[PDB]
């Protein structure tokens, strides 16, 4: 199918490499790449991970001069700001190139056009889906991690080579896999699940600890304990994801078992219009449209929510709790 | 009635006039008040047609000195940056001005204050309805075409013969006509054409392409050929402008015209109150809002819906049947 | 694809043909077919449109005549009354016949059942989709119009060669194109057209009026020039015509873009209902009987209708003001 | 205002007139202007009327006769059969003439462009309102009565003129008045108190009875006798004519005031949109195509109407007492 297992590394052999960042990617990846035979350079703010960067033997220019010495650059940088970031120290040097490929880790500001490289670039993405700690967590152990392949803009007629290049340039195949995908997706899919299912989850646990407490008078420390301050939804994805979201549920009870599937073919449908409205939200651009608007304006509404959201009565229950048991 | 006809070229002969651009209408309504007899100047962005404006024989300065030197200005540029240009550029020699008279093509900026000069320049508008090939056009025919005259701010009593001056000065009246109206008066109505009318006939072509190949299994190239692909509606428009709109009808079968009236009357309704919701928007200035900050954000929907209609189904099969066609 | 670019002209060469009007097709495509090398005869009423045909050198017996002579034979007439005229004056000289060949340029009257020929007639369709002016516009141009092919019944094995034959005996390929489609799909499209988009396109223009005149204080001179009574809608699908409908709006402002693809895509929905409801009417034959009706009832909603548009507001203005500016 | 009180009667005398029918009106009428001193003629339908007619010394030829003779003819005939009458026996004769007048008592037929004379005649109506009777039972008392006068097409500038010579020409000013009106206003006065005032009347009346029956336990004699088999709504009617519709009901009991005045107040608003929707189906035609279609099928709906009527409780209960009473 459209996966793939493993590919080439020729591109990159002879060439310079820019990477930009030394956080949690750009220090794994960058790490990997030195040790998989390539000459790497890298670019950061000279700061504390600046440190740590020439720390663990990486020369590191300013970010201008690691794109002149590079024919290709990665751009392992946040999300939020690096529209500024790449108009004003980045865009000027890349004018003054032929035939450079830049790779990023999310789509979202390629996929809506708030980075628009020029026609001499071969435009390309890939992202994995771990936080980036369970990356070294496999391989130290020799394995390999999966992965979305995206081609943006094609000037040269081998973006894909040069993506499954990068791919195997990182450690991922062989021992992982490797997924092909626009931009879109990438952005799409890292949207939807950020909109709902994970606020969904919390909503619906805050709302069972509000009712248990205050219509059938019940102790706080009980209901944090069923709902959310025991591990039992660690162990729950750890099955998950080793045997499968079904056949997970054997390890239950039958009458789990039997709720959980009627109250799940129960309330498919309105789920199913939350993820609608939310998808077709995000396909448009208007989401980004509103976080970028929310950043120009000063985070107000960020923070009262993160201040509500503290203040309310689970989570300093939540607290005098996780005091009780020592959990920091 | 409000119109006019023809009217005096007085308050101009004497006078220096700054004409800012060499676009579409620059280049002709400069060309034409040259040819009308009068001290003209010019002033342009340093680029491709600063070439042509300087080729064509009109002595270009730059912005700010073409002010200094001419007591009236027309700003002949975009309506999507123009704010930040006036900020910078011209309001500081305007502040070194008294007797000024700065007139629009447009009233977007100024109908929603986006542009407030000082109480020292009697402000105006005129603006033709042409896309400005339309306007040479007529003029090798030596006819006129008609505008929409605006008074913004009077600080000599003359604002309005000054209105007529200029009218004159470009080839409309004697010819055409010179209706006159607010600022607010003309960004309205072009503002509802582009928000009602235009949008939901593309919608509605949209959908029955869809429909009619979804669902009744008809082949891409008859619905294109039907809908828009001919040139129908434009021989339709023709007779429109040339008869009027119902007497166009007169060449149609007796079928068509049963059809269209019974059909109009029927949804009168809906696109009335729809109308209407979008006038509301315009007039307490929410759209320019919308646009605006758009702008600032970066593009991101305007962006994402121009992929989506081009992506479409229609857009592919378009596209194989023009090239079929030799359409370019 | 199911297109065709040229075909035979072999099995009409050797028959004679009927041609049974003379208006705007019945003269054009007998003068290119005379003029393809054919031998052809004219039936007609005998009246001013008799007169240009054996003016122009075409002999005219009677229409039973013109068939009775011929063996294949073309209505181009039509479509409110022909179903008498085909019942008392073809009918029975058809009976007389054997292996006949009757073609059409609307499906109406035969998608319907309103005339069903016998078993001993191969029954075809093509229709082209101008008015017809633009045909001789093209063909001194050597040029090659687009059409729709159908068959209805098939007495000979070759009933589509026989299409294709005509198809090129009327100067459409090679130089335009021939599509293939059933009888319903033509009469299906060109309802919709004068059932959806037309009718919705006025009313809006319509309430455009109405609104800005009596809750914006607007004069009506204004309103009128913006919304049609200025040639930008003509300009406008000329542009559609050649380029394509989206990449036509390039040539407009940022503003009008982001307005017009933000409002297509937020009425697409209700306009789409719309399309459905009419489509699934006239699908199921509802339409041709209320048109059929109001035939025989005298034609009372037609004449009122046709009195209420004129009496209109609007087109008073209209009629004073196209008096203005010359036009008739 | 726009009412006349008397006029001429000078274009009438040395031409004569074509009476077309001598049923209510045309027998009164025409024995009024042969009174008031014009030679006039009556065309007929040879039956009981025409015996009547020629009995009563009026000399009538056919119908297409006595348009030969006259310049003007008058259709004093239905309203439901007029059409066919008018293209067979009249059309022709009338296509034999330059300068003719054709005057209605109603214009249903022409308001709603069922008949169309040529522009070789002055076209008007005028109308009574009386049902016919009145008219001598005012004649005798040396009165006149009220009337609207209407004027369709001119093509003498003298239809008005003419208007109000046949206006004086049938005993109505002065004594009466006469009002002016187009075909439209009195077709659209004429049925909507057939359609709106009239029926809610009857139905109110019927369910009054139906429900004072059916859950009060009353006899139907006495429901009969309060709500219409006395002559208390006749009184009423008279009363109203006479001194006006509210202060009529000073001769009433407070109680009825009170109660009358407060639910007319309350319910305007419903028979309000009933009289709306009405109006509206009238003004664009509906109705005539209705009518026309249900006389063109055989009058079904009629036929089963008047059969639920009379075999309906109430008209049994009716039939029982009248025949008590006496009353046929
Ligand atoms: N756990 C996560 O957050 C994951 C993040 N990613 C992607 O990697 C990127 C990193 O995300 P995070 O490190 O979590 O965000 P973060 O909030 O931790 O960003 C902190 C870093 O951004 C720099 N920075 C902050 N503001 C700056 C400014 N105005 N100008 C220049 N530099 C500035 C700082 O130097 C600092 O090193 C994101 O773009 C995201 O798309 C992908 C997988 C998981
Ligand atoms: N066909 C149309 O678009 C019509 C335009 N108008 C009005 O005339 C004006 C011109 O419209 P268009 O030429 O079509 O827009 P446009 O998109 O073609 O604007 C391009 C011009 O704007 C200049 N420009 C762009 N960005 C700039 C920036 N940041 N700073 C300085 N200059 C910048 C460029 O030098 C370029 O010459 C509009 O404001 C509109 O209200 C009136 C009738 C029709
Ligand atoms: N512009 C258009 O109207 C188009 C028409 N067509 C098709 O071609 C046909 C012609 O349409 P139009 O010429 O526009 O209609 P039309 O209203 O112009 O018809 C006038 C013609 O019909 C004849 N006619 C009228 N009533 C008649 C009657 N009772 N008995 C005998 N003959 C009568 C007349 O002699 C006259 O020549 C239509 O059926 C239509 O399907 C196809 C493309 C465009
Ligand atoms: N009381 C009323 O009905 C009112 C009538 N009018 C108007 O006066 C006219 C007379 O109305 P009515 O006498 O009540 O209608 P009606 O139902 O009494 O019509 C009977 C007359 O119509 C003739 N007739 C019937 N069918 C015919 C046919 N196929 N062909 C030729 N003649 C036919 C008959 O010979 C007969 O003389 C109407 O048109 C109406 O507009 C105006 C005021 C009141
Ligand atoms: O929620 C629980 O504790 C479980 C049960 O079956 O009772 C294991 C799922
Ligand atoms: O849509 C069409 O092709 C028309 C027809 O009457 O059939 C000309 C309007
Ligand atoms: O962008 C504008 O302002 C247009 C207008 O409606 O006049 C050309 C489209
Ligand atoms: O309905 C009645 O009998 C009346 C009353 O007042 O009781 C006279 C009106
Ligand atoms: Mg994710
Ligand atoms: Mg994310
Ligand atoms: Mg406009
Ligand atoms: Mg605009
Ligand atoms: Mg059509
Ligand atoms: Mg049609
Ligand atoms: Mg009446
Ligand atoms: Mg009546």
Not at 121 to 143: F, W, Y
Not at 182 to 203: C, K, N, Q, R, Y
């Amino acid at each position: 199918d459209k996966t793939v297992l493993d590919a080439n590394l020729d591109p990159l052999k002879g060439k310079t490499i820019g990477v930009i960042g030394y956080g949690n990617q750009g220090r794994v990846q960058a790490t990997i790449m030195r040790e998989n035979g390539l000459n790497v350079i890298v670019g950061n703010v000279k700061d504390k991970y600046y440190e740590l960067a020439k720390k663990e033997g990486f020369e590191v220019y300013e970010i201008d001069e690691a794109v002149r010495r590079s024919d290709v650059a990665l751009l392992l940088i946040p999300d939020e700001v690096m529209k500024e970031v790449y108009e004003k120290k980045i865009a000027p040097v890349l004018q003054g190139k032929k035939e450079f490929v830049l790779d990023f880790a999310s789509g979202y500001n390629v996929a809506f056009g708030l980075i628009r490289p020029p026609k001499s670039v071969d435009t390309i993405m890939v992202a994995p889906r771990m936080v980036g700690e369970g990356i070294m967590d496999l391989h130290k152990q020799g394995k390999g991690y999966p992965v979305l392949l995206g081609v943006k803009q094609d000037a040269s007629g081998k973006a894909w080579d040069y993506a499954k290049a990068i791919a195997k340039g990182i450690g991922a195949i062989p021992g992982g896999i490797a997924v092909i995908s626009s931009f879109e997706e990438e952005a799409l899919l890292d949207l939807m699940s950020e909109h709902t299912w994970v606020p969904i989850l919390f909503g619906a646990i805050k709302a069972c600890y509000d009712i248990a407490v205050k219509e059938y008078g019940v102790s706080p420390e009980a209901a944090l304990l069923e709902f959310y301050a025991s591990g039992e939804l660690a162990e729950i994805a750890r099955l998950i994801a080793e045997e499968g979201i079904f056949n997970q549920m054997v390890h239950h009870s039958t009458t789990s078992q039997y709720g959980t599937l009627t109250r799940m073919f129960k309330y498919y449908d309105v789920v199913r219009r939350i993820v609608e409205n939310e998808a077709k939200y995000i396909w448009d651009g208007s989401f980004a449209k509103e976080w970028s608007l929310e950043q120009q304006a000063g985070y107000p509404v960020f923070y009262r929510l993160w201040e509500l959201a503290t203040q309310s009565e689970m989570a300093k229950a939540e607290k005098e709790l996780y005091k009780l048991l020592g959990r920091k």
